[PDB]
Design an enzyme around this catalytic site. Sequence first.
Site, PDB file in Angstrom:
ATOM      1  CB  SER A  22      19.993  23.450   7.067  1.00 55.52           C
ATOM      2  OG  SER A  22      20.053  24.604   6.251  1.00 55.52           O
ATOM      3  CG  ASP A  72      17.364  23.284   2.832  1.00 54.01           C
ATOM      4  OD1 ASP A  72      17.277  24.236   3.639  1.00 54.01           O
ATOM      5  OD2 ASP A  72      18.163  22.335   2.981  1.00 54.01           O
TER       6      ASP A  72
HETATM    7 MG   LIG Z   1      20.545  21.437   2.791  1.00 54.06          MG
HETATM    8 ZN   LIG Z   2      18.301  24.870   5.344  1.00 56.61          ZN
END
Ligand SMILES: [Mg+2]
Ligand SMILES: [Zn+2]
EC number: 3.1.3.1
Lengths: 482, 482
Positions: free
Chosen positions: B93, B43
């Site tokens: 995200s 991430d």
């Molecule tokens: Mg996340």
């Molecule tokens: Zn992200």
Amino acid sequence: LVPEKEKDPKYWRDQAQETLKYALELQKLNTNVAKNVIMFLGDGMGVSTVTAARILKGQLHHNPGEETRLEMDKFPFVALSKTYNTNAQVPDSAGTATAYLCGVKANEGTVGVSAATERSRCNTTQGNEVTSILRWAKDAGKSVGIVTTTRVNHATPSAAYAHSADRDWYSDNEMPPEALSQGCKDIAYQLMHNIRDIDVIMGGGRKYMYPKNKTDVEYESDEKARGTRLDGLDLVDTWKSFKPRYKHSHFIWNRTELLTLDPHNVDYLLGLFEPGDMQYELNRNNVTDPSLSEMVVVAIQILRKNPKGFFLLVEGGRIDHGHHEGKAKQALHEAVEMDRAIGQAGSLTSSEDTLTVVTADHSHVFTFGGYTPRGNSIFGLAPMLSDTDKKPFTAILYGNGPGYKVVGGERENVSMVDYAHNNYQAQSAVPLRHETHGGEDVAVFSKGPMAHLLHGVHEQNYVPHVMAYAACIGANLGHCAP
Amino acid sequence: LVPEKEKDPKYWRDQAQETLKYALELQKLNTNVAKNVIMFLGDGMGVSTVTAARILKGQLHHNPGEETRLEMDKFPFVALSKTYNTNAQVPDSAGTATAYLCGVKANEGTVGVSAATERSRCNTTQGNEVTSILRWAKDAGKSVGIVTTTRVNHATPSAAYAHSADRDWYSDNEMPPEALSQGCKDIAYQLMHNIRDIDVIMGGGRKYMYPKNKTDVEYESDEKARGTRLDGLDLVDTWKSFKPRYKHSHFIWNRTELLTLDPHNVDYLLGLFEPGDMQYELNRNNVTDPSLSEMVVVAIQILRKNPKGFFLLVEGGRIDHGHHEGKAKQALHEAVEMDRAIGQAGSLTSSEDTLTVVTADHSHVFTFGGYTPRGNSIFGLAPMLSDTDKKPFTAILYGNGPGYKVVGGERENVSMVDYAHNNYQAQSAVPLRHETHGGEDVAVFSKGPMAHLLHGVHEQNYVPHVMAYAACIGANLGHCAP
Ligand SMILES: [Mg+2]
Ligand SMILES: [Zn+2]
Ligand SMILES: *[C@@H]1O[C@H](CO)[C@@H](O[C@@H]2O[C@H](CO)[C@@H](O[C@@H]3O[C@H](CO)[C@@H](O)[C@H](O)[C@@H]3O)[C@H](O)[C@H]2NC(C)=O)[C@H](O)[C@H]1NC(C)=O
Ligand SMILES: *[C@@H]1O[C@H](CO)[C@@H](O[C@@H]2O[C@H](CO)[C@@H](O[C@@H]3O[C@H](CO)[C@@H](O)[C@H](O)[C@@H]3O)[C@H](O)[C@H]2NC(C)=O)[C@H](O)[C@H]1NC(C)=O
Ligand SMILES: *[C@@H]1O[C@H](CO)[C@@H](O[C@@H]2O[C@H](CO)[C@@H](O)[C@H](O)[C@H]2NC(C)=O)[C@H](O)[C@H]1NC(C)=O
Ligand SMILES: *[C@@H]1O[C@H](CO)[C@@H](O[C@@H]2O[C@H](CO)[C@@H](O)[C@H](O)[C@H]2NC(C)=O)[C@H](O)[C@H]1NC(C)=O
Ligand SMILES: *[C@@H]1O[C@H](CO)[C@@H](O[C@@H]2O[C@H](CO)[C@@H](O)[C@H](O)[C@H]2NC(C)=O)[C@H](O)[C@H]1NC(C)=O
Ligand SMILES: *[C@@H]1O[C@H](CO)[C@@H](O[C@@H]2O[C@H](CO)[C@@H](O)[C@H](O)[C@H]2NC(C)=O)[C@H](O)[C@H]1NC(C)=O
Ligand SMILES: *[C@@H]1O[C@H](CO)[C@@H](O)[C@H](O)[C@H]1NC(C)=O
Ligand SMILES: *[C@@H]1O[C@H](CO)[C@@H](O)[C@H](O)[C@H]1NC(C)=O
Ligand SMILES: [Ca+2]
Ligand SMILES: [Ca+2]
Ligand SMILES: [Mg+2]
Ligand SMILES: [Zn+2]
């Protein structure tokens, strides 16, 4: 925004499936020999620059920009390369140049010599010289070419022909007394002398070929444009003097002449279009100086004649000096120009016999973010103000550089300046005269014969070993079994 | 420094030639079917981050670091992916998660639904749901698994099972009244309810499974850690209630139970180790909470049993919150931990039948430069002070993070701070509460069956179409054509 088609899943599904179809077709590989090898170098063209330049190309066509496809994005094979120098975590243009051209990594500041050569120490040059892919091509009979918008003796092109202990030794003028006394020759001198039969040479760097205080043809009044050679040599003549008399060899300095030349007639072409580096593409004069795209076209037309093949090195170059000054609009525009020349080279060559590689020497501290909406200009502002200082901020931001402008404890209120102006410098975290390079990895786009050999994440010196193997030049001539 | 072996050209030449030999060996492609598919998601792991995490890993071994090889660097195939959302140039995200998991690009904030669904408009959800590769695998008989250090209901893993109009709807507690009355169900509810036979589920996010004002077992004293479900349900019980009785199904909440489990016995596992997101790897308690690598090891052991195969989705996760908080030292250590988990998974599976893919959802405005020497700590300072304010600056600099520090009209003199502290926030150009994302492209490293199909620069929605094709799941099952 949201185009109506991008709301439908079938659109994305078909798009991926068609991409899957071509991906499956690429399982049949191009194991052919590389009759020609063309290498494009965007000086400072990191993945951040590539994405922003993609948005710019599409936005100049009144599109959102994110969905646009650069000519380099159309290359089938992509791989990253680790740019670190033997001496430097964040590398320079010269040491990297020795890697992707000569096949060996070196110290920062050196050009065409191994890591045993120490910078500015001329007596350590001897014995530590490393040849470039250019030499291997000419030694294998192929024609060679160097096209750049920077000086022909700049760091990136110099690694092709010269082996000097310092990249700053453009001419004998900049060489220290010890260097001359030890027998070191300047980079410009090595251009004409090291490899004499270099077919095509185009770019800036005129003042370094004429003796000192000689007046430049384009700018006779400019004291800066005056020659620099203490040797009192006309290297432009020295160029043709090594060329055979029966071969047609022309020297040019402006665009009008360049477009008038007939490629079938020209066997050797030398073009110095500016005393120093050529201007940015946004500042180019349409009549006096040529664009990189046209310069690449004429080069290929001249080099295609040799049946044994040709090697061509093109350098966008000015992206570096653009990021250095924090002017993202200048650097990004230079990048789009190189992409155009890459697409043109696709029409002048065939993918069956020509290996094309687009890569960069290093990245930059260029950042592009701020949760901007779809289509938002690449030079646009953030949608919302900062929660802290309650002032707006640009999407493009540099880490360090001259764009840092703090008025008395307060960052610059950017809503009142012309951030879209060509010479606007985005905000910075640390003030520097020039922005620095970046240790991040750069991409390598490859199309053509054996381009699938440029896979995965590997070192920067690995790139020329693939090209040389595909073209059956250099040390490993195994691709063509004798 | 200058390593002595790196002073000899033959060293680099031999190393490059060795890379060529294996590159040619990879011309024999892996056309086998993918029995197993493992997807690692860093991430916020941009190209800037992978390089920095590479430097860090090697430096933790008292090495310079630039030459170190991350486990993802050993993947044979690399490709760039376009991260833009339908609504946002710089993506979030959630929408990205819909792309590489469900195969369709979506709007910012939406999860598991197409671009026709509007954020928070619950009545636009019906008809616009898009299934994920997790579902295709479980519908194809393979065991399925989700491992993350963030909440099990966070944005990145939720796209695997949930179809929600807003990522903020963790539990019914955070859902607006109209959403509930229109029939929308929260993410946590959809974890147990959408796909009942999800074999392995591990991560934080306990409070979203237990009724309101309840008590957290690990922290009985924290009112914040107390449960939040206003509907008054024990989703943990809802989990076992759907699981068959003859199948052993265990719930754990601390590391001691996880390491004691026998994978041969466990058929279904739900492990929630924290009320919210799990701690950073630098602040993790050795006895109470496990590392991501430990979670991945036991997870693979449970899922390996299914003879038809298994799919596992892993998320380093905390890298994002590390960059968001401007503390690069937190994020980088998180990235190296994820890389270690990749190495663990490498010995537990075979490259012949298991397709492994490492990618990122987006980048960050995180950059490191300053012409630092070889080995200079990744959290270290630049070699020379700035020419402008005559003060040193860190090698790592953020674009628009909270690290902006102006003490009485001057940026902070870093010689007086602990730039090596784990919670130090590098300087930024624009002050914000949280650092922004980055529009830059991310890399896709692929090893295993059909991994050569994730080539070149393509869109983000393309990643799951390769995995599904290799595993013979989804719509196009032509890889196992009779
Ligand atoms: Mg996340
Ligand atoms: Zn992200
Ligand atoms: C940074 O500079 C800009 C100047 O461009 C400042 O924003 C400006 O704010 C003024 C008033 O604060 C705006 O003028 C008028 O304001 C009144 C509000 O009562 C209203 O009647 C008018 O509609 C008009 O907006 C001006 O338009 C506005 N300019 C822009 C470009 O937004 C801003 O406050 C400065 N920021 C800081 C933190 O000092
Ligand atoms: C940023 O912080 C550093 C560290 O506090 C400052 O450098 C310090 O500057 C003082 C000047 O008062 C130095 O003292 C002088 O040092 C030399 C010998 O080191 C000597 O010639 C003098 O007698 C005097 O004591 C001090 O050593 C130096 N500290 C370090 C660690 O280098 C710097 O000035 C600060 N910068 C700004 C712009 O405020
Ligand atoms: C040649 O260059 C000039 C200036 O560099 C360009 O002239 C501009 O023309 C546009 C409309 O075409 C005007 O809006 C500008 O005001 C002009 N500027 C100047 C300074 O003359 C011209 O377009 C260029 N021609 C090309 C690139 O073919
Ligand atoms: C660019 O260069 C050529 C160099 O020859 C210039 O053309 C010459 O002009 C002089 C007088 O100005 C003539 O005596 C020569 O015969 C010309 N040379 C040729 C080859 O025709 C030309 O003026 C320049 N073009 C531009 C735009 O500056
Ligand atoms: C358990 O974590 C602790 C950190 O909390 C590690 O021990 C630390 O060791 C350093 C080294 O000097 C000390 O400064 C800390 O005070 C120690 N803390 C504690 C709580 O012992 C320990 O190595 C970890 N153990 C394992 C197996 O990972
Ligand atoms: C982690 O979990 C286990 C089980 O939830 C805990 O073990 C329990 O320990 C208590 C004492 O605090 C005993 O009364 C229980 O009988 C134990 N349960 C079982 C199933 O054996 C353990 O306390 C926890 N470990 C940590 C570090 O919290
Ligand atoms: C050359 O240069 C340095 C002095 O600057 C000295 O170490 C050495 O004696 C000379 N020779 C070599 C081969 O380095
Ligand atoms: C959905 O939401 C709003 C509720 O305020 C309402 O305007 C509308 O009737 C509904 N639209 C659809 C398409 O169901
Ligand atoms: Ca000119
Ligand atoms: Ca815990
Ligand atoms: Mg250059
Ligand atoms: Zn450079």
